[PDB]
Amino acid sequence: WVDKYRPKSLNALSHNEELTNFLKSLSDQPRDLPHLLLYGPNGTGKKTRCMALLESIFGPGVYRLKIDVRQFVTASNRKLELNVVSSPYHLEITPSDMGNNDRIVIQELLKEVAQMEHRYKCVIINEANSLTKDAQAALRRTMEKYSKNIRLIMVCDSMSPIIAPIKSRCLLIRCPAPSDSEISTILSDVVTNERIQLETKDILKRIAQASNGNLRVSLLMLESMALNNELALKSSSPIIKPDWIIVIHKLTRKIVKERSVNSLIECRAVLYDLLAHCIPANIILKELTFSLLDVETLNTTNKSSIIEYSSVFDERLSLGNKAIFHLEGFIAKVMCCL
Amino acid sequence: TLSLQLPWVEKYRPQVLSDIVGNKETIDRLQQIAKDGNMPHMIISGMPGIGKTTSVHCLAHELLGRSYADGVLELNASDDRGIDVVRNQIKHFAQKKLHLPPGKHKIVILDEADSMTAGAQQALRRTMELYSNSTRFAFACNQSNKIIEPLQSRCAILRYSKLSDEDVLKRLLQIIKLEDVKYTNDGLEAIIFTAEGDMRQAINNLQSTVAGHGLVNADNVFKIVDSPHPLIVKKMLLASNLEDSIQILRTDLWKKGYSSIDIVTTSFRVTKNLAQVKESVRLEMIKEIGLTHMRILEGVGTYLQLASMLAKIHKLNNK
Amino acid sequence: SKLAAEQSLAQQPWVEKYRPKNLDEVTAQDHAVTVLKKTLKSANLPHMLFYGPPGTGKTSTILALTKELYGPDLMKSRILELNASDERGISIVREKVKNFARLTVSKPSKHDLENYPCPPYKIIILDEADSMTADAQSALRRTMETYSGVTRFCLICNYVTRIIDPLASRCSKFRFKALDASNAIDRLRFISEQENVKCDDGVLERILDISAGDLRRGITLLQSASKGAQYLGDGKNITSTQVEELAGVVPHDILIEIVEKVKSGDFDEIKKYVNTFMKSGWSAASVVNQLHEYYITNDNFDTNFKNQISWLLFTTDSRLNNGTNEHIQLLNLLVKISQL
Amino acid sequence: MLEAKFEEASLFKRIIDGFKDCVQLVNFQCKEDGIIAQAVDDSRVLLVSLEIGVEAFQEYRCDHPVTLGMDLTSLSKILRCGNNTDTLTLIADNTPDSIILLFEDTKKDRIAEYSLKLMDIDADFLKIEELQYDSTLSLPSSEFSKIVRDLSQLSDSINIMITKETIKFVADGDIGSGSVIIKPFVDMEHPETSIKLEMDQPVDLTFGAKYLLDIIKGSSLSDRVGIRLSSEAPALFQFDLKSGFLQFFLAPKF
Amino acid sequence: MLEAKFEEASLFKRIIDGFKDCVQLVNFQCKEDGIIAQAVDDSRVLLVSLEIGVEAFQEYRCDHPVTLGMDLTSLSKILRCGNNTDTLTLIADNTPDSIILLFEDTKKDRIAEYSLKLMDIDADFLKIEELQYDSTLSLPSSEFSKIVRDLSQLSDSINIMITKETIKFVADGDIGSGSVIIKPFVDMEHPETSIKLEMDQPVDLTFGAKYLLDIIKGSSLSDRVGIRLSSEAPALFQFDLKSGFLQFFLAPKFNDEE
Amino acid sequence: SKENLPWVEKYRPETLDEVYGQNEVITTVRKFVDEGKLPHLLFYGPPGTGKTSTIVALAREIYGKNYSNMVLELNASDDRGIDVVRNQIKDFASTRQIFSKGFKLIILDEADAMTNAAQNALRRVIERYTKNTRFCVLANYAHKLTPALLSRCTRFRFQPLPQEAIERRIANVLVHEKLKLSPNAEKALIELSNGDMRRVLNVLQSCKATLDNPDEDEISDDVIYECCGAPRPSDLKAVLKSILEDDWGTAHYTLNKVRSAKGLALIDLIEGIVKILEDYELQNEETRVHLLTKLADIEYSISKGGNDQIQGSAVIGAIKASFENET
DNA sequence: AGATTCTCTGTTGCTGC
DNA sequence: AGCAGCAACAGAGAATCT
Ligand SMILES: Nc1ncnc2c1ncn2[C@@H]1O[C@H](COP(=O)(O)OP(=O)(O)OP(O)(O)=S)[C@@H](O)[C@H]1O
Ligand SMILES: Nc1ncnc2c1ncn2[C@@H]1O[C@H](COP(=O)(O)OP(=O)(O)OP(O)(O)=S)[C@@H](O)[C@H]1O
Ligand SMILES: Nc1ncnc2c1ncn2[C@@H]1O[C@H](COP(=O)(O)OP(=O)(O)OP(O)(O)=S)[C@@H](O)[C@H]1O
Ligand SMILES: Nc1ncnc2c1ncn2[C@@H]1O[C@H](COP(=O)(O)OP(=O)(O)O)[C@@H](O)[C@H]1O
Ligand SMILES: [Mg+2]
Ligand SMILES: [Mg+2]
Ligand SMILES: [Mg+2]
Numbered sequence A: 001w002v003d004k005y006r007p008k009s010l011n012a013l014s015h016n017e018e019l020t021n022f023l024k025s026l027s028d029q030p031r032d033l034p035h036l037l038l039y040g041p042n043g044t045g046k047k048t049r050c051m052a053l054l055e056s057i058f059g060p061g062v063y064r065l066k067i068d069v070r071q072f073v074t075a076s077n078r079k080l081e082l083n084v085v086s087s088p089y090h091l092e093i094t095p096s097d098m099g100n101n102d103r104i105v106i107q108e109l110l111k112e113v114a115q116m117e118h119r120y121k122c123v124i125i126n127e128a129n130s131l132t133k134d135a136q137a138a139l140r141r142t143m144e145k146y147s148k149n150i151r152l153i154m155v156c157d158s159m160s161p162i163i164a165p166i167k168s169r170c171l172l173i174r175c176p177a178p179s180d181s182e183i184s185t186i187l188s189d190v191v192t193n194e195r196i197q198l199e200t201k202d203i204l205k206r207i208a209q210a211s212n213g214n215l216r217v218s219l220l221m222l223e224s225m226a227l228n229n230e231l232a233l234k235s236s237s238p239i240i241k242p243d244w245i246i247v248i249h250k251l252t253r254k255i256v257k258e259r260s261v262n263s264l265i266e267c268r269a270v271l272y273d274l275l276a277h278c279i280p281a282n283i284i285l286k287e288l289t290f291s292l293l294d295v296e297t298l299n300t301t302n303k304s305s306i307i308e309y310s311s312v313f314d315e316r317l318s319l320g321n322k323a324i325f326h327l328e329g330f331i332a333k334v335m336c337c338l
Numbered sequence B: 001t002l003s004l005q006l007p008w009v010e011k012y013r014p015q016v017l018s019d020i021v022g023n024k025e026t027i028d029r030l031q032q033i034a035k036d037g038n039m040p041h042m043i044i045s046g047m048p049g050i051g052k053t054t055s056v057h058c059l060a061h062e063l064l065g066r067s068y069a070d071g072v073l074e075l076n077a078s079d080d081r082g083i084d085v086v087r088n089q090i091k092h093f094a095q096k097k098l099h100l101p102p103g104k105h106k107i108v109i110l111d112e113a114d115s116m117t118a119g120a121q122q123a124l125r126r127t128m129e130l131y132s133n134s135t136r137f138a139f140a141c142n143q144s145n146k147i148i149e150p151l152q153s154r155c156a157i158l159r160y161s162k163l164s165d166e167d168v169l170k171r172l173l174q175i176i177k178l179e180d181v182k183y184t185n186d187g188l189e190a191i192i193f194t195a196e197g198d199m200r201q202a203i204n205n206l207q208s209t210v211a212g213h214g215l216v217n218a219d220n221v222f223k224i225v226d227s228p229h230p231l232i233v234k235k236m237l238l239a240s241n242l243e244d245s246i247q248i249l250r251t252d253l254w255k256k257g258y259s260s261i262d263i264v265t266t267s268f269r270v271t272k273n274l275a276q277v278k279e280s281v282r283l284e285m286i287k288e289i290g291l292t293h294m295r296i297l298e299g300v301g302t303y304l305q306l307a308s309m310l311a312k313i314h315k316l317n318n319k
Numbered sequence C: 001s002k003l004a005a006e007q008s009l010a011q012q013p014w015v016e017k018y019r020p021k022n023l024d025e026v027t028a029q030d031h032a033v034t035v036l037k038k039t040l041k042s043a044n045l046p047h048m049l050f051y052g053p054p055g056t057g058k059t060s061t062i063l064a065l066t067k068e069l070y071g072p073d074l075m076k077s078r079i080l081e082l083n084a085s086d087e088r089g090i091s092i093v094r095e096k097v098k099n100f101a102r103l104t105v106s107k108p109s110k111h112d113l114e115n116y117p118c119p120p121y122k123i124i125i126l127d128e129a130d131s132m133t134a135d136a137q138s139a140l141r142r143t144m145e146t147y148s149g150v151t152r153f154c155l156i157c158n159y160v161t162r163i164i165d166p167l168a169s170r171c172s173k174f175r176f177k178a179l180d181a182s183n184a185i186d187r188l189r190f191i192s193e194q195e196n197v198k199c200d201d202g203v204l205e206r207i208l209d210i211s212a213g214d215l216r217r218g219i220t221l222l223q224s225a226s227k228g229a230q231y232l233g234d235g236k237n238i239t240s241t242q243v244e245e246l247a248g249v250v251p252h253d254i255l256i257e258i259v260e261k262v263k264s265g266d267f268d269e270i271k272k273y274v275n276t277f278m279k280s281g282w283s284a285a286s287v288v289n290q291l292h293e294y295y296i297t298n299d300n301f302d303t304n305f306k307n308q309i310s311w312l313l314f315t316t317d318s319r320l321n322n323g324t325n326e327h328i329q330l331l332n333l334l335v336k337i338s339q340l
Numbered sequence D: 001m002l003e004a005k006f007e008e009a010s011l012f013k014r015i016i017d018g019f020k021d022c023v024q025l026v027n028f029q030c031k032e033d034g035i036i037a038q039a040v041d042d043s044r045v046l047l048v049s050l051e052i053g054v055e056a057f058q059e060y061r062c063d064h065p066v067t068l069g070m071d072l073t074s075l076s077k078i079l080r081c082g083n084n085t086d087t088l089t090l091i092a093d094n095t096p097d098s099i100i101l102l103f104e105d106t107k108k109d110r111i112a113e114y115s116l117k118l119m120d121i122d123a124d125f126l127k128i129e130e131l132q133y134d135s136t137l138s139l140p141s142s143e144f145s146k147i148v149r150d151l152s153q154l155s156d157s158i159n160i161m162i163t164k165e166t167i168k169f170v171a172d173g174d175i176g177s178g179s180v181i182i183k184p185f186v187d188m189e190h191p192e193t194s195i196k197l198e199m200d201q202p203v204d205l206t207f208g209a210k211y212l213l214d215i216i217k218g219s220s221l222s223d224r225v226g227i228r229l230s231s232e233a234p235a236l237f238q239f240d241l242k243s244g245f246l247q248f249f250l251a252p253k254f
Numbered sequence E: 001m002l003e004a005k006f007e008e009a010s011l012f013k014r015i016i017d018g019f020k021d022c023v024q025l026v027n028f029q030c031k032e033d034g035i036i037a038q039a040v041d042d043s044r045v046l047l048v049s050l051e052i053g054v055e056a057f058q059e060y061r062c063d064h065p066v067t068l069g070m071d072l073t074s075l076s077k078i079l080r081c082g083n084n085t086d087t088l089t090l091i092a093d094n095t096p097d098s099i100i101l102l103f104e105d106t107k108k109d110r111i112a113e114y115s116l117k118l119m120d121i122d123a124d125f126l127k128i129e130e131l132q133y134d135s136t137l138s139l140p141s142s143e144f145s146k147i148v149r150d151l152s153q154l155s156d157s158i159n160i161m162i163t164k165e166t167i168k169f170v171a172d173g174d175i176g177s178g179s180v181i182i183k184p185f186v187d188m189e190h191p192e193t194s195i196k197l198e199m200d201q202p203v204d205l206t207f208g209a210k211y212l213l214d215i216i217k218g219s220s221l222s223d224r225v226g227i228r229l230s231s232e233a234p235a236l237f238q239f240d241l242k243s244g245f246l247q248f249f250l251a252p253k254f255n256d257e258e
Numbered sequence F: 001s002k003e004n005l006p007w008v009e010k011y012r013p014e015t016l017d018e019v020y021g022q023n024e025v026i027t028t029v030r031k032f033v034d035e036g037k038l039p040h041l042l043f044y045g046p047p048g049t050g051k052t053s054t055i056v057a058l059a060r061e062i063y064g065k066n067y068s069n070m071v072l073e074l075n076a077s078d079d080r081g082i083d084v085v086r087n088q089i090k091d092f093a094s095t096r097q098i099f100s101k102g103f104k105l106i107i108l109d110e111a112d113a114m115t116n117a118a119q120n121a122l123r124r125v126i127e128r129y130t131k132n133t134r135f136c137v138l139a140n141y142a143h144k145l146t147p148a149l150l151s152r153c154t155r156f157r158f159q160p161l162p163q164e165a166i167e168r169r170i171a172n173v174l175v176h177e178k179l180k181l182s183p184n185a186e187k188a189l190i191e192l193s194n195g196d197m198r199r200v201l202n203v204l205q206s207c208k209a210t211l212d213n214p215d216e217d218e219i220s221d222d223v224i225y226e227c228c229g230a231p232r233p234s235d236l237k238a239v240l241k242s243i244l245e246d247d248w249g250t251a252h253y254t255l256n257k258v259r260s261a262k263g264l265a266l267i268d269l270i271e272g273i274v275k276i277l278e279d280y281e282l283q284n285e286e287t288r289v290h291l292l293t294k295l296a297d298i299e300y301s302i303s304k305g306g307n308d309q310i311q312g313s314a315v316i317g318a319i320k321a322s323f324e325n326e327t
Numbered sequence G: 001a002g003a004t005t006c007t008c009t010g011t012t013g014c015t016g017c
Numbered sequence H: 001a002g003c004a005g006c007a008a009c010a011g012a013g014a015a016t017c018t
Helices: A017-028 A046-057 A102-116 A133-145 A164-168 A180-193 A202-211 A215-228 A243-257 A261-275 A281-293 A300-319 A323-337 B024-036 B053-071 B083-095 B118-130 B149-153 B165-179 B185-195 B199-213 B218-224 B229-237 B242-254 B260-272 B279-300 B303-317 C002-010 C030-041 C058-074 C090-102 C110-115 C134-146 C165-170 C181-194 C204-211 C215-232 C240-246 C252-263 C267-277 C284-297 C303-320 C326-338 D009-019 D072-078 D141-152 D209-220 E009-019 E072-078 E141-152 E209-220 F024-035 F051-070 F082-094 F116-128 F147-151 F163-176 F183-191 F197-210 F221-228 F233-244 F248-261 F266-277 F286-302 F308-323
Strands: A036-039 A066-071 A081-086 A090-093 A121-126 A150-155 A171-174 B042-045 B072-075 B106-111 B135-140 B156-159 C048-051 C079-082 C122-126 C151-157 C172-175 D002-006 D025-031 D034-040 D046-053 D066-071 D087-092 D098-104 D111-117 D135-140 D157-163 D166-172 D177-182 D196-199 D203-208 D224-229 D235-241 D244-250 E002-006 E025-031 E034-040 E046-053 E066-071 E087-092 E098-104 E111-117 E135-140 E157-163 E166-172 E176-182 E196-199 E203-208 E224-229 E235-241 E244-250 F041-044 F071-074 F104-108 F133-139 F154-157
Touching: A017 A046, A017 A171, A017 C215, A036 A046, A046 A121, A046 A150, A081 A102, A090 A102, A102 A121, A102 A133, A102 A150, A133 A150, A133 A164, A164 C215, A180 A202, A180 A215, A202 A215, A243 A261, A243 A281, A243 A323, A261 A281, A261 A323, A281 A300, A281 A323, A281 C267, A281 C326, A300 A323, A300 C267, A300 C303, A300 C326, B024 B053, B042 B053, B053 B072, B053 B106, B053 B135, B072 B083, B083 B106, B083 B118, B118 B135, B118 B149, B165 B185, B165 B199, B185 B199, B185 B218, B199 B218, B199 F024, B199 F147, B199 F154, B218 F024, B229 B242, B229 B260, B229 B303, B242 B260, B242 B303, B260 B279, B260 B303, B279 B303, B279 F286, B303 F266, B303 F286, C030 C058, C030 F197, C030 F221, C048 C058, C058 C110, C058 C122, C058 C151, C079 C090, C090 C122, C090 C134, C134 C151, C134 C165, C165 F197, C172 F197, C181 C204, C181 C215, C204 C215, C204 C240, C215 C240, C252 C267, C252 C284, C252 C326, C267 C326, C284 C303, C284 C326, C284 F248, C284 F308, C303 C326, C303 F286, C303 F308, D002 D009, D009 D046, D009 D072, D009 D087, D009 D209, D009 D235, D009 D244, D025 D072, D046 D209, D066 D072, D072 D111, D135 D141, D141 D157, D141 D166, D141 D177, D141 D209, D141 D224, D157 D196, D157 D209, D157 D224, D203 D209, D209 D235, D209 D244, E002 E009, E009 E046, E009 E072, E009 E087, E009 E209, E009 E235, E009 E244, E025 E072, E046 E209, E066 E072, E072 E111, E135 E141, E141 E157, E141 E166, E141 E176, E141 E209, E141 E224, E157 E196, E157 E209, E157 E224, E203 E209, E209 E235, E209 E244, F024 F051, F024 F154, F041 F051, F051 F071, F051 F104, F051 F133, F071 F082, F082 F104, F082 F116, F116 F147, F163 F183, F163 F197, F183 F197, F183 F221, F197 F221, F233 F248, F233 F266, F233 F308, F248 F266, F248 F308, F266 F286, F266 F308, F286 F308
Parallel strands: A036 A150, A036 A171, A090 A121, A121 A150, B042 B135, B042 B156, B072 B106, B106 B135, C048 C151, C048 C172, C079 C122, C122 C151, F041 F133, F041 F154, F071 F104, F104 F133
Antiparallel strands: A066 A081, A081 A090, D002 D087, D025 D034, D025 D066, D034 D046, D046 D244, D087 D098, D098 D111, D111 E176, D135 D196, D135 D224, D157 D166, D157 D203, D166 D177, D224 D235, D235 D244, E002 E087, E025 E034, E025 E066, E034 E046, E046 E244, E087 E098, E098 E111, E135 E196, E135 E224, E157 E166, E157 E203, E166 E176, E224 E235, E235 E244
16 A cells, blocks of 8 residues: 555655655755755655655654644634644644635634744645635735744645745655656565565556656556455556546547547537546546547547647646536537537 | 805706707697696607706606605605515505595606616506505606516606707707806807717816806806817818828827827727728727727737727728 | 844845845835925825746845835834735725824834935835735725825735726835846845855856746746755856756757757657656756757748747736646647647 | 813713714814813714813813813723723823823732824814804703603604794604694703793704714713704704813705 | 532622633533533633532432533523522532522522533543743732723733732723733722732743633622733633632743743 | 925925816806806816815816805814704805805715715705805715715816826926936836836935936936836846746746836736736737736735735746646 | 613624626 | 625614603
């Protein structure tokens, strides 16, 4: 399992040695530490490295944490309900659990934590990409006014939606996805500790080649296919793909097979069924476009138009709120292109 | 200075239904109603400054005679007209006992009926239905769609239209004869052109020109009351060459102090109401006028944005 | 008292440790601080509107000005600082700001008038005015127009277009210039000498070159490089390569590989290389900036190609500035520039 | 400087109760012969004018006049600490940014002290009082309050009409009409209940009931109220104090 | 079982008035030596703790302790039937689903009886009272109420500062600042008006005005109020009853903490 | 003292003779007030044209020095709702003056931020109480006012300040202050004003502060350009020439050195190049279409941030590709 | 002097733009 | 995803009556 075998310190990391050394350098002197922003691909291990860095800045009790609840009142008595992950040395907030009320929670909670205060209390903002521009503007001055009591460690997957002032107000640390060799070495230790039977080691490499640098996905897929092969992986064990990926692949097959309005209706139905089951539309568009480019029936002229339309409708979706209104438009434009 | 004089819109405000130069059909209808009596519930809709409030005031006055003070209940948008007022005061007035001639009824005048809340309008239904034999309701609004259909079902509907050139010219000639003002044909033509079927605005511009220069001439009217804003915008959009439209926008609109928001919004109205060009090109021009609006509402409102909007409109018109 | 403040500053990151306390610490924004120093002897401070790129020193300049004006005693009694972390609707602007403006100035003490000018007005600053709605901004118009005798308004923003035209007309516009290597090398060298940052010849000038007119990011990069060089303990000097490694800059060889894949290669090879490159975490904005620098600077492409590459890079940056997916935008940009 | 000590904080509290609600900003000015204060409502139909002579205080010292403006709401918020029997001292320097209210009990025991922030108001005291009014009348203020409270229910306008030996208050609105007619009379059994009237010219003025309602508050300061009416100026309703008076000037409805 | 009869329903009504508003759930427990009750507000800055000894009742019988939790609002809703002079008897079995309030007039006439639904609350009574506090003071509770009511208008925080022979309450906010200074004194003309102060160490704590306002309600139960302050723990405000007391423990503001 | 107010507030006109630029409306208003017929006024115009100063001086001339008491002045800073109208404005209009005898004046400054319900309630207050009071509505945008309210008032459009009036005011300020101004400096100052007296006064105070001397010297173009951070026509035309004729790399180097030597902004250079190219007599309008579209797109992108170098290269490429169609 | 009832003010919720 | 305008309900304070 991903959680049973996870590093708890900086000396327990097993990939990106230069990043581990940079983290040790940054944690050598912990009091004169500026705000940090960890950016990189999703599933690389930045959330583990931030906790490992906190384990170097503070005692080992940083992992012994608790979940509490805090209520907030907007203009309405509506009591925005937000759960907080707290520790005797740091606290974690995820403003991605609500709508446009990120600014209120951010400002009020951070001001309460900064007024109450090694000597400072660390703050981990999870998924900073979902932070609205108004919440980021509110945090802009809170980052600078209280710099001796509150230090921010913002974990995100892409600095594209992060505003320039916030980018300047904190150090930027990139976490490149681990190489397939390091993923294979980690899976080897996992299968020798979990007592899995490998007929040939190369299958582990293939797992990496099916994960695209994602370790969280790699270990989960390895464990999922270890339950289908009954704890004994053979030389030709099938690759376990998530359900939504299969739905997207079938959608692309339907797209390249039939291009009409009658097929556009069932495409809209598939998009609705995908969106209704807690699947973001940006990831849907990304996977749909990337798997449509893989269609060998199309030519360069079709793929260029497809990628242009996907960029245009990605901008539309980032500027809109009704995601299906942009997804169906992109699908119709792709149908018109082919 | 110690005191002012009454404006010509208020001084020469018609007090008899014959002095109204509005829509002849509805005017004769209301005149015959006041002559015979039995005034029904009515809703008068139209545009500002065409003789809606004056019409109902004249009707109520002629119908009630001296009992206007104790038989007419006036409620404007300046007074509270919520559910509580309709429940208490309007109902007390409708239930009030009053000895009237056998052809008259108590009149409840409600100015700006399009601003009353939904609750008050809903409560007014049975209020006007149970006392429809001793109390009558006259609504005066600008948008009949703002009044609920149940209220419109219990009353007559009088839609007032714009005043043609002849009627406003006749009224202005009557006012000039009554005031002994020096005028000229081109000056009155410019006044009527800048009025756009608005009698109140026409009389106001006439009085302002008289008190500012004395002689009602087209030069004076144009120097005091700038030409209609929408017409210059229409001439700018209907330009055939880009340089002509750019020069028009620069000299007529930008060099005279017209804000970019007014230019783009007036521009939208002109286009929506345009009829010279087809539907698709009009929709494309409206689309382009929109991006410029979004950019100006975001604070990027400058001359370059309007120039780019005009360039895109011309490119759309460039086949 | 003062010693606790000195120790807290010494245990503070270099961004807040070296914050300008006086109007003389401002290194490059001289045109504004000259007027601010001249009006310090007079008493006709007008309403001001600071605007410019982030990290140019607007907040630091106004803080230093308010300090030099009022002293550390009246610093907390004659100042109304409203940031973006507070509510700034119509209700707040009408009640709190107007009540503070209508109030009279607090009496200065005997020690205040002996060392500081103590002007007869107070200062209400509104930091990050971009988030203020236009109606709440128009509400400030007569508030700042009629009570100018007792209070002075200082707006601070990054985009001057977000503030309505009447407010921009009422206030004196102060544009803060980008802090490139030329006008900030002195400040960067001072910060390096005060911290014993042993670097090479072309490091500091390079740091600001990566900063692109941002002294805060440059100071943060210098602090990170100093920490990374002190952890090693080798006693050597910081190199430009070590600086550009932690600054998020793509190495030159990886960029040359992208140029080769764009010049020679089809859609499939370019897509595969982009998928491989997105595995290593790089900011798409930095990649676009480096590609723009390389393509515009290289004297080996046609002008017709240069117009198209410039427009494509502009469109890609404008799309990336809206929170889009970096992978899709980068792939689309590389594909569009490969068809050229 | 300002240094005025009231024997009973209650007097000042009742005076401020009079400005309360109907006005937002008040401009005070202390000087050698006492304290004056003026406040005008937003619509400018009501002026509240106060005068407290030196003798109304237990201690008053002034070697240099001071003018100070303030938000009444803020003042009343603080004006409920007087215990009524507490002693109240108003204090301010010659160039104040605040006004100090100091409440103390006889014994050293409890001392409540406030420092109220001042507002800057352009000094512009009005002097609209007339030499002669068309008619003048006084009557018990509780009676005037009842008269106003009666009629108020009927209309937003209350008319006051004066003819020889007759004072008539009238209201007429939706539910009907009402009137209160009073006649001049000297009661020796106690003249504080008499109703005097001196008419030089019959008067007939209309006032907004909402304003008369604000004005009746003065009953708490004096047993009688003086009403002076004119067709040439705002009406004057006056409540006398020991050495002083609270005046309300109200513009008739046009 | 629970069987407690109050001579006057009024005493219980005033006691509950003290928990009122500031807390929602109250946990009562009757036992051989009386009744205790504890309630903590949601933010956990205020604890209301009651103790009523056997002698405060006209009749009390307990052969088996019973713990019962209930909604304060529900209880007060029912607590206005006492006529104040009515007799009140609290009744409950050993494993109750309800609490019975029985109000009766002297004569057999009116009998108002209520059966209040109980809530299940994990029994966890706190014992946060200290052996010694930095400073201790008592003064008339009506005086304390006035002091709190004065300052409250100025700020959401009221500071209490104690130095030798000096107690000072201070509030400072938008409209300005205020302070009330009182000095210890023995009044023989009636010592219920005296102001005592025992200071082992100067103290200076800040409290949220909204909470002090909740606390002043105890004036209706006792002529005097005892205030015990410490820099190590929540402050204690205590209102004595005949055989018993109502205590309010309030956590000082850290800088922002009620 | 008035020596502490800023130059925008210190030099506020107190009489109608100190309001320059507006002559056709000022004379008409003076005639309205002298002859007595003063209708409901609607002063529509851009910011800094002198509408508030005009109406304040008018009320001063009408009522005297006691203007602050006989006039009801409401603005956006004050709460202006429908209930506020109903109570305050109606009680002011229905009653009479407490200080003198005469008509009343209600100055609804910045009435473009009022609610639609407030205007719908006020349009019948203006029409009912019209014999004892008047209404003056000041606006910058005529689209935020309902047509019913817009038709009840006489509209006066405040044109931007012309060259003669702004130079007269500059001369008045140079007389009131111990300051000298160069003719070309004065022309450059008038160029960067767009008829806004506020900007002129602010930058005049700022360049007087920039002088660093006891004011025995003059204020030249260099002082104005360095204080307002505005680009000079020389550098503007040099950049335009290097873009139009010189090589791509040379044009990039020229733009970089120009924008980095004086710290100029890219948006100011964009606006300057747009203003200069407006006089260029060009061929088929396709070049103008492309130029305007691309320049407006780049301006809208700059209004949100980004890479200054990328945007400068985009400006260069856009101008070049637009002019490549002219051959 | 205490208790009860009525009125006014403030806060919260819902609806409309 | 403000505001505002609203209107209605609840709580507190003051006055009157027993
Ligand atoms: N038909 C008409 N004949 C003569 N005068 C007219 C006529 N219509 C309008 N007027 C003048 O315009 C003034 C105002 O007219 P109103 O009836 O109030 O305008 P309206 O048609 O009701 O539109 P509103 O009130 O803005 S919704 C009158 O007092 C007259 O002076
Ligand atoms: N001109 C300058 N001279 C010296 N240090 C500077 C200068 N500008 C910025 N800094 C440094 O950068 C830090 C941040 O300054 P700020 O004034 O907050 O920047 P900024 O212009 O406010 O950027 P924002 O807040 O995102 S708009 C200061 O504390 C200094 O350490
Ligand atoms: N015509 C003018 N003559 C002289 N000074 C002027 C003139 N117009 C503006 N000013 C100056 O500019 C200042 C501001 O004028 P205002 O009347 O407040 O501007 P405005 O026309 O009302 O536009 P707003 O207030 O932004 S809607 C005045 O105090 C004068 O110093
Ligand atoms: N140093 C490491 N060595 C081995 N496995 C690691 C290491 N760091 C993280 N992992 C594992 O790799 C996966 C990374 O995914 P995840 O933890 O979700 O990433 P992130 O920390 O960025 O959220 C998880 O299974 C995590 O436990
Ligand atoms: Mg009408
Ligand atoms: Mg800042
Ligand atoms: Mg103005």
